[PDB]
Symmetry: C2
Subunit: 128 residues, 2 copies
């Protein structure tokens, strides 16, 4: 809940309007915490991860990646101009996501990223 | 543990040799339950799911899919001729995997599947 609220505030500081939280989505016989936001007509969806959810970073990464792929597929078929981002803390970005394997998997799967700083609750970088 | 043993027995009945359980794999700075098996020089790896692991089937599917993608990527770089399969029970195959959304995601991500019957502990179908 805390990291969810950190990401909303970071988005708000950059002038995004939060329109749905959660963004709910059902497609192809399945009902799938996503934040929907927009800013001057640019629409996005944000999958928030703290990377304290599990065990290891790698275990969380598996679930985060699968969710990312599935939500991205679902969103194509419902709101094709809403771009999906995986939000992760700066500490995780600078450590886990600098390892060769996760960096490669992010690239192979075209994962777009919102890097947020937890302490100050700000957006540090948009990736891809 | 039970479903893990069901899949091994199903493989053994079809003349597969189990060579590693777990198959361990480390690549690109990360250490990633996978069964390694072979039969007349054909090598495979099997990610076993019962689809009783979580909450809903969809929640498990997210983790199963992310794991599949990451293990498949790791295996390319270590044992490129060992083909990865996602093992799922026949009951799940005939219900969840006949829904349009999971069927589509399996197709989009080229997920190969081992469909096993739990009651009789046999392989029913190989997919993709
Ligand atoms: Cl941070
Ligand atoms: Cl079954």
């Amino acid at each position: 809940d805390v990291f969810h609220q950190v990401v909303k505030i970071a988005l708000e500081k950059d002038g995004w309007q939060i329109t749905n939280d959660p963004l709910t989505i059902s497609v192809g016989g399945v009902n799938l915490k996503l934040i929907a936001a927009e800013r001057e007509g640019e629409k996005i969806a944000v999958e928030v991860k703290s990377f304290l959810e599990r065990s290891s970073a790698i275990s969380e990464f598996h679930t985060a990646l699968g969710q990312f792929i599935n939500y991205r597929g679902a969103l194509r078929r419902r709101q094709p101009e809403r771009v999906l981002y995986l939000a992760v803390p700066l500490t995780t970005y600078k450590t886990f996501f600098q390892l060769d394997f996760p960096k490669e998997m992010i690239a192979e799967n075209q994962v777009k990223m919102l890097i947020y700083d937890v302490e100050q609750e700000v957006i540090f970088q948009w990736i891809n």
